[PDB]
Structures are given as C-alpha cells and as structure tokens.
C-alpha cells in the first residue's frame, strides 16, 4: 500500500479516458453509418474487430479497480435512448456517471453480480433499433466474463450470457434488420462466443448440439444472402468434425458449400488449411500440397504466432510424401526450437537410405507426434522411403538399366525392382517408360511444345485476374 | 602493439581446433605471449593449451608498474594542464587505451574508447578510434561491434577526409569473406590491389594477393575474368612469385582439368590453415568443381564419359556419382546416361529462358496486388 | 570464346553449325518493365500504409 497502493492512481484514469472514448467513437460512428449510407462495411467496424481480438482483450482482463472497467457495468446499467428526450436524458447520464466513476467508487460488481448488471442493460427501456449497440456492448463484456479464466460457476454464466445474446441475435434475425445488417458484426460475434463455447463443451460433454444449432444457423445464413456469413460459420462447423477423431472426413467430402467467394484475407487462409488437411488424408497429395502452399503464403502477417508454424508443420510432411523439401528452420523462433528438431531430423533420415534411424526417431519423438496429431506418417511415409530414391534416380539418369538400379537403391534384386518402378509410374511419380525387351528404363523425351502451345493456358488466367482488379477498382471507386 | 597483432588470432585458432596441429604453434606463441607483456586475453588459451606456469605473477607486477607509471602520468596531467581535445590529456589517455588492447582485455579498452570518442572534434582522430574498434572486433569476431562502427565509418565520418578509406575497402570485404559473401562483394572491392605497405591498416600483402585471387573465380567465369586478373599487371607480378597459385589460375583458364584438381587439392589443404575459415572449406571446393563442369559441358551437346575417363583424371564411376549428385541438386543442366554412356545436355532457349523469368516475376507481382487490393476496401 | 557458332559431339565425333535469333529485344524489354512495376507497387503500399 505505500509501494503498490500509491501506484494504484495511475492505471484507471487514462483508460478511464481514452479506452472509454474507444466505444464512444465506435458506437457513435457505427450509429452514424447505420442511419445514413446504410452500406456500412467501411467504418471502424473492422478496426474495432481487430481491436476486440487484440486490444481490449489485453487492455483489460479483470475489471480494473478504482473504476476503469469496474465502472462500465454501473455506467451502462441504465440505457434507454428511446425517444429524443430519452436520448438527451441518457446523454446527461453519459455525463454524470462518467464524472462519478472518474471521481469516486460506483457499484462494484464482485465478478458474480455481472449478470444482474447485464439484466438492466437488456432492461431499463432498451431499444431494438439500436441493435448494434445492444449486440456490441453485450458481447464486449463477455470477454472479461470468459478471460477471467477462473472457470468455476462462471462457465454456466458464460453459457447463460451467450444464450442471452444469441436469443437477441436470433430475434434480430427474425425481427428484420432494416438497413443495418449486423451479420457483418454478428459473424465474429458468433465466432468469439463459439470459440469458448467449444471450450466449455470440451470441459463438459460433446458439442454436436452446437453443430445442430450451427446447421440451422448456416441455413438462415446465405438463404438471406451472404455477407461473410457462409465464410465464418463453415470454418466453425468444419473444425469440430476435424477435432473429433472419429471418421468425419467423408462428411466433409460431400460438404458441397465450397463458395465463400471472399473472406477479407483472413478466413480464406485458414479455410485452405482445413481442406488441405482433408485432401491429404484421402491420399490426394498433389492438390493438397499446393493449397497448403497457398494457405501459408496468403496470411503470414504476424509475429511468430504458431498456426503459421502449424501450416508449415503439415506442409513438410506431404512434401516428404512426394520427395522434395526446402529450408525450414531459416526463420527460427524461441518456440520453433522445440518444433524444428523432430521434423528437420526426420527429413534428414528420409533423404538418406537409413531406416534404422527412421524407426529410432519415431520411437524417440513419437510423443511429440502425439501432440501434433500426426500418427499416420509411419504407415504412409515408409512408402516414400523407397520411392524417394527412384524419384531421385529417374530425374538424374536418362536411360538406365534395371540391373544397375538394384544396387543403387541397394535392393539387391532386379526382379522386384521392375515392380517398384512399375508402381511409381502407376502412381505418376515419374513419367518415364520401361523397355521390357533387354532391361532398359528410359526417361521422357526432350523439352516439348512448352515454348509454343502451353503459355496461353497460363496467360488466360492472368488477363482475367488483372482486369477484375481493374473492375473491382472502378466499381468501388466513388463514394462521394 | 596492434600492427602485427592478427597473427596471434591465427595461432589461437590453429592451435585449438586441430589438436594434431599442436607442435610448433605453442612454441612461438607462449614466448610471444610473455613478450609484449600479454597478460589478460590468454587465460582462455591457457585453459585449452598447456596447464599453468607461474610467470603470471611476475608479469602482473610488470603490468601493474606500467599501468601505475601511466596512471600517475595522466592524473597529474588532467589536474595541472587544462587544454583538452586532441591535446596531451588525449594521447596519454589513449595510451591507456592502447595499453588495454596490447595487454588487457577488450572491456577496459572499449570503455576507454567510448569515453575518448565523446571528447574529440578532429574526425581523423575519431576515425582512428573507429579503426581500433574494428580491429578488436575482428579479433574476437564480434558481429555486433562491426555492424555499428562500419556505419560510423561510412555515414558518421567519411563525408570529409579522403584516401584513408581505402584501408577500410580492404576491411569491409575482409568481413565479407568471413561471412558467406565469398561470391561477389569481396571480389568486387578487393579488385583495387594498389596498397602494398604491410601495415596495420594493410595487414599483409602477399596473403592479400592469395585472398583476392581465390575469391575472384566465383564472381565471374567469362564475363571477362581475364582482364582484371590475367591481363591485370600488378596482380601478375606477385603471382609470378608464387608458383602454385599461377598454376592454379592457368589450369582453369587454359582448360587443363587434370592438373587443375592437383592444384585444387593443394588449395583445399592449404585452406585448412586459415582463421576466417568456417565458411571456406566445405563450400569452396564443391562450388569450384561444379564451376569447372559447367564450362566443360559447354561447347558439347553429346559427351561420352569415357572421354572424361582420361582427359579429366581417372575413375569412371567417380565422375558418374558426382554428376548424379549435381544433376539431382537442381544444378549442372544436363542428363547423365547409362549403357550408351553419353552425357546428354539440355539448355533453355530465347523463348524458354524469357518465359521462365516472366512466369515468376509475373506471379510475384500478382500475389503482391492480391494483398494490396484487399488492404484497401476494408 | 564465342568466335564461332557451333557445337561438338563425342558420340559421333561431329562438328555442327547453326544460327540464332536476334529477336530477343521484345522479351528483354518486357520483363524490365516488371522491375519498374515492382517499384511502383512497393511505393503505393507504402503510401497506403501511411494513411488508411
């Protein structure tokens, strides 16, 4: 109290000022675009959503005593804003209570009285026309309600307060959102609730009841029309079925909802991560590793985040299922030091013809493979242990005898080495052919019509992509 | 002093990592260490070399007497005589700083350096201090010292004085040889070879000729290698002295490949006795072998490797296994063959090389405007 | 040493003489504009980062 109690006055008041003016400017500007210019996608909706991911989760977790976030619940406990006098009188309540909470101590909820301080926000003549104000300022106290991390009897208060919001969410969907379309906000509201509602149904029984809801939730989305609604709910619906270690993937193979068609550079990158894992488990390796490559190079804009290290984690496996491997640890991190050592030493043993080391480091680092969820490499990469060399030989040599490839693959038998070469050309590993007359295995022909016939079949996409940039530029040009 | 000082850092390395190389290096280092009153930096070497010997206390009272002789010199100087800058207080207090590089460790020397740099206005004396940081940072290969004071040399100093920067033109690319820039920058600014006085700023001349000729044949093969190192005159004087280096040159240019490897194996074995050595020895030979293969497979489109069995060396299977590693490496653009035993090559054309470049530069800019079109418009 | 337009064979011991097209001037100057187009997009994204 002379040490820390004297350093108690500095933490409230500037978060009582500039963090308070955050949602004051957000709630004012979202209302300003909900009223006029009803196409309200281009506002601080996006940056506040980037803030509610980043800023206000780490701006405050606890309600920040001496009334910075502790005051937010008795501040917004009395919100009518109903008619023009009921707006102007609540504008006086925006003046008086922020002066009291800036001066003295108001009604401090002791972390369990937060839900009755979510009743009179829903009560006290609250409106339906201010449905962004109800939707945002109810979901934004749910993150101190979940990231308190005590997880005891607030978990059911998590369960109640989300279904409080989701009853307002569904009723807004039933009661006809005139010219606002909160779905642009309610998509990641439906995400942020169901990230931790998935955690709650991991701390309790299964979340197929969420999927039965989310099927009906995906039904009312995009039957109206899609405004990021099909994009968010599909990665939410796909994640549980991928999280369950049951069969679950041919359900996703028949999932013919593969058009989100735009995702603001963030849903599409992780969507390509999930479906790249799906096409990898049904053994289609070529299309998988190129859309896993597309997912890695689309949204890496972070600072050593980890899921970027997870899409980099699965990408090296399917490339070891087709032979090639680049430099991996050239972007080493304080946490990548843990996760570089198994995989770099894995492809170390794959490139050489050593299998005793390959079985040893399986035994050495299998428990790390248990944490990554990749048991299946031992049953399906021992295929490519013998197939990496025959890909390497047939790229090097041009017209080889099968009697010499037996010692070069150290197989010590020419009679079955015909069949390994037969299986690789059956799988399309190498395009080469075999002369079964005197033992010749010759490669392909020279560089083909590639200089003449091909390049327009690359040029057609680049015309069509660049003029659509010109089209999307011109159409979205003039707002004034 | 500090003028022949970099021979010590050679004998630190040459004694340490090859323990079999431990006969004559210890014989002329320890006697050289009891010379010049070298007392601080050898305790690490005394752990790795022979155990202990008590002349430490004898030279400690010698290193304290010379410290105290200069201690009473410059405290009386700073308390009686009050003209400063590059004055008598300056060169006495740098004689402390020169004492702590010659005898002491870096820590007392660097804090005397950063103190005396904040006092002076003549940038020549400022640049001489930066010359002293760059040398002690080259001793202990401190990569964080050298990134600072080279920026001090380029930006903060050298807008003025002139042609003492050519001393650093030997240093900026001497640091590029200890990095992996064994390719183009080191060969580019070692090309001005006219600084011959074997000084501290020009640490040696004949080894500098061997350094600028080893790095030169990787920057350029025939975009006129022959003008700068073969038609060059003052470079040709000193390689007329050294018989093996000129033999190592003209084997490559006049295309005698059998004697080229006999020279190259001597170079790699002579490479082992270097102190900026860690990126050389695995990477230099493997680059020069595929360097000679590219010009040999050039001018031919149908080579039998039995012609490479005697016009090249020996070992039919040895060429076979080394080409197979290089073709699989994504380099050495040809196709090796069995029982016809004819190495067949392939190269791109006008259309094939210009399309392979535009297919990559196009996709890089296309991916670049994917992101840029989505940063704007929400 | 480019004093000649040819190639050799060891499988037949044969000298072969050919010609080459000088008409690379279109494709040479084609991708040099991409270097100019690379620098302007780097400049625009710098301008767009400066203000939203």
């Amino acid at each position: 109290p002379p040490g820390g109690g004297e350093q108690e006055p500095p933490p409230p008041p500037a978060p009582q000022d500039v963090e308070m003016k955050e949602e004051a400017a957000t709630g004012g500007g979202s209302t300003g675009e909900a009223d006029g210019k009803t196409a309200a996608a281009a506002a601080e909706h996006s940056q506040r959503e980037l803030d509610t991911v980043t800023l206000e989760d780490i701006k405050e977790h606890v309600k920040q005593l001496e009334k910075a976030v502790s005051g937010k619940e008795p501040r917004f406990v009395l919100r009518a804003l109903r008619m023009l006098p009921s707006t102007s009188r609540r504008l006086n309540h925006y003046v008086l209570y922020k002066a009291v909470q800036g001066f003295f101590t108001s009604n401090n909820a002791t972390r369990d009285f937060l839900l009755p301080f979510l009743e009179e926000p829903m009560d006290t003549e609250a409106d339906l026309q201010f449905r962004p104000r109800t939707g945002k300022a109810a979901s934004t106290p749910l993150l101190p309600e979940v990231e308190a991390y005590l997880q005891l009897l607030v978990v059911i208060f998590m369960m109640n307060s989300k279904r409080y919001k989701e009853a307002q969410k569904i009723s807004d969907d039933l009661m006809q959102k005139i010219s606002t379309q909160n779905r642009r906000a309610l998509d990641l509201v439906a995400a942020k609730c169901y990230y931790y509602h998935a955690r709650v149904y991991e701390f309790l029984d299964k979340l197929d009841v969420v999927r039965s809801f989310l099927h009906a939730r995906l039904r009312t989305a995009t039957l109206r029309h899609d405004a990021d609604g099909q994009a968010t709910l599909l990665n939410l619906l796909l994640r549980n079925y991928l999280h369950y270690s049951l069969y679950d993937q041919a359900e996703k193979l028949v999932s013919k909802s593969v058009f989100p068609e735009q995702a603001n550079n963030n849903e599409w990158a992780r969507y390509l991560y999930y479906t790249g894992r799906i096409k990898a488990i049904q053994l289609e390796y070529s299309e998988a590793r190129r859309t896993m490559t597309n997912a890695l190079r689309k949204a890496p804009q972070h600072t050593a985040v980890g899921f970027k290290q997870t899409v980099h984690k699965l990408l090296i496996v399917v490339e070891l299922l087709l032979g090639e491997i680049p430099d991996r640890l050239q972007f080493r991190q304080p946490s990548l030091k843990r996760s570089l050592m198994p995989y770099f030493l894995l492809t170390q043993a794959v490139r050489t013809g050593n299998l005793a080391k390959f079985n040893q480091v399986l035994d050495q680092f299998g428990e790390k493979f248990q944490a990554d969820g990749t048991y299946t490499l031992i049953i399906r990469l021992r295929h490519n242990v013998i197939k990496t060399g025959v890909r390497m030989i047939s790229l090097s040599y041009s017209r080889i005898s099968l009697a010499d490839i037996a010692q070069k693959l150290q197989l010590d038998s020419p009679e079955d080495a015909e069949f390994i070469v037969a299986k690789a050309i059956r799988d399309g590993v190498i395009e080469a052919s075999i002369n079964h007359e005197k033992g010749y295995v010759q490669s392909k022909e020279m560089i083909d019509i590639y200089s003449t016939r091909e390049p327009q079949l690359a040029f057609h996409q680049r015309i069509s992509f660049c003029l659509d940039i010109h089209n999307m530029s011109v159409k979205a040009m003039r707002f004034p | 002093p500090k003028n022949p000082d970099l021979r010590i850092a050679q004998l630190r390395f040459l004694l340490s990592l090859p323990e079999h190389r431990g006969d004559a290096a210890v014989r002329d280092e320890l006697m050289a260490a009891v010379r010049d009153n070298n007392m601080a930096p050898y305790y690490e070497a005394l752990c790795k070399s022979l155990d202990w010997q008590i002349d430490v206390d004898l030279l400690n009272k010698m290193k304290k007497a010379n410290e105290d002789e200069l201690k009473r010199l410059d405290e009386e100087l700073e308390d009686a005589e009050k003209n400063l800058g590059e004055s008598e207080i300056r060169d006495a207090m740098m004689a402390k700083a020169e004492y702590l590089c010659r005898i002491g460790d870096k820590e007392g020397a660097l804090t005397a350096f950063r103190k005396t740099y904040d006092k002076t206005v003549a940038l020549g004396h400022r640049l001489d201090i930066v010359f002293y940081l760059l040398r002690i940072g080259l001793f202990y290969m401190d990569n964080d010292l050298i990134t600072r004071n080279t920026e001090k040399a380029k930006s903060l100093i050298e807008e003025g004085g002139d042609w003492d920067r050519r001393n650093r033109l030997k240093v900026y690319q001497g640091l590029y040889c200890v990095a992996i820039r064994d390719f183009k920058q080191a060969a580019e600014l070692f090309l001005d070879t006219v600084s011959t006085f074997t000084s501290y700023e020009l640490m040696d001349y004949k080894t500098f000729v061997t350094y600028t000729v080893y790095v030169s044949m990787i920057a350029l093969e025939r975009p006129d290698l022959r003008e700068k190192v073969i038609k060059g005159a003052e470079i040709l004087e000193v390689l007329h002295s050294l018989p093996a280096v000129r033999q190592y040159l003209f084997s490559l240019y006049e295309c005698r490949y059998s004697v080229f490897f006999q020279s190259l194996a001597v170079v790699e074995q002579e490479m082992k006795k270097d102190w900026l050595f860690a990126p050389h020895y695995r990477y230099y030979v493997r680059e020069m072998r595929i360097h000679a293969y590219s010009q040999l497979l050039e001018s031919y489109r149908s080579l039998t490797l039995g012609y490479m069995a005697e016009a090249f060396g020996v070992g039919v299977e040895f060429i076979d296994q080394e080409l197979s590693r290089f073709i699989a490496a994504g380099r050495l653009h040809c196709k090796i063959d069995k029982v016809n035993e004819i190495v067949e090559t392939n190269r791109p054309d006008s259309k094939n090389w210009q399309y392979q470049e535009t297919i990559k530069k196009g996709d890089l800019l296309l991916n670049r405007v994917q992101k840029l079109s989505r940063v704007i418009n929400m | 040493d480019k004093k000649f337009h040819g190639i050799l064979d060891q499988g037949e011991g044969v000298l072969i003489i050919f010609d080459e097209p000088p008409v690379d001037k279109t494709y040479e100057a084609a991708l040099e504009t991409i270097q100019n187009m690379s620098k302007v997009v780097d400049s625009l994204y710098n301008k767009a980062k400066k203000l939203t």
């Binding site: 010109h470 530029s473 040009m477 | 704007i376 | 084609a30 302007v40 203000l51």
Partner: peptide, 30 residues
C-alpha cells in the same frame, strides 16, 4: 503482362487518391 498489369495499377491509383479525398474531406466537413 503489359496491358493487363498497367491498366490495373493505374486504376488502383484512382482508388487511393479517391479514398484519401473521401475521408479527408469528410473529417474536415465538421
């Protein structure tokens, strides 16, 4: 590669020049 790229990049200039002139005239209206 010449006519599809440059036509797209020039119209992309007209976006940033308009999006600057949109909101910097909007924030100075009040």
């Amino acid at each position: 590669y010449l006519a599809s790229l440059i036509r797209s990049v020039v119209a992309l200039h007209n976006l940033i020049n308009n999006k600057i002139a949109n909101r910097d005239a909007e924030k100075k209206e009040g």
